[PDB]
């Protein structure tokens, strides 16, 4: 799960 | 904002 | 599953 | 908002 | 259990 | 995608 | 328990 | 992704 | 890679 | 949603 | 590596 | 969300 804000 | 679950 | 808001 | 499941 | 994709 | 368990 | 992905 | 337990 | 939604 | 990489 | 969201 | 590496 990786988020790039 | 993009998330890769 | 990847979402691009 | 587009999601690619 | 109900999922709404 | 939202699930309600 | 409800999750909103 | 937010879950409300 | 297998996902079970 | 469970993924097994 | 297995994740259970 | 629990991951078992
Ligand atoms: O675009 C970025 O700044 C960063 O994005 C992340 O996903 C990459 O792992 C990192 O190496 C990049 O520096
Ligand atoms: O359009 C964007 O900003 C981003 O969209 C994501 O899906 C791509 O993985 C990333 O490389 C892009 O920078
Ligand atoms: O790395 C991936 O498998 C995917 O990552 C997503 O962000 C991109 O939009 C998609 O084109 C790629 O196929
Ligand atoms: O990468 C893909 O297979 C698909 O991704 C979707 O977002 C595009 O609308 C579609 O035209 C592509 O064929
Ligand atoms: O919100 C919706 O569009 C739909 O959501 C589903 O869960 C309901 O069973 C269906 O009757 C609704 O039309
Ligand atoms: O905020 C949303 O888009 C959705 O969030 C879900 O939890 C609700 O069951 C659905 O009726 C909403 O349309
Ligand atoms: O039924 C429930 O407990 C919950 O279901 C979720 O989808 C709604 O977003 C939340 O407002 C409700 O409190
Ligand atoms: O229902 C709740 O207690 C909480 O649910 C969260 O999603 C809301 O962000 C928060 O403002 C509420 O206080
Ligand atoms: O557990 C399940 O319902 C399903 O899980 C999938 O991964 C299997 O390919 C399918 O044969 C099963 O019926
Ligand atoms: O605990 C669960 O509901 C699920 O957890 C997953 O990791 C298992 O592959 C699946 O067979 C189970 O049904
Ligand atoms: O195959 C595996 O290593 C693992 O796959 C997961 O889905 C099961 O929940 C876990 O008990 C197994 O040890
Ligand atoms: O398999 C393991 O080592 C561990 O996996 C975790 O998910 C269990 O909560 C923990 O009790 C086990 O000891």
DSSP string, F1-5: -EEE-
**CA distances, E4 to each of D4, F3, I1, I5 (Å):** 14, 6, 23, 11
DSSP class of residue A2 equals E
- The answer to whether the CB atoms of B5 and A5 lie below 8 A apart is no
Method used to obtain the model: cryo-EM
Strands A2-4 and K2-4, bridge-based pairing: unpaired
- Partners of D5 on chain C (C-beta within 8 Å) are 1
Calpha distance L1→K2 (Å, rounded): 11
- Whether residue K5 contacts residue L4, with contact meaning beta carbons closer than 8 Å, is answered with no
- The answer to whether the CB atoms of D4 and C5 lie below 8 A apart is no
Beta-ladder partners of G5: none
Residue C5: HSE in the Cβ half-sphere, 13 Å Cα cutoff: 8
- The CB of J2 under 6 Å from ligand 10? The reply is yes
Question: Atom of ligand 7 at shortest distance to CA of F4?
Answer: 7
Calpha distance B1→B4 (Å, rounded): 10
DSSP class of residue D3 equals E
- Tokens matching residue J5: 């990489």
């Amino acid at each position: 799960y990786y988020c790039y804000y």
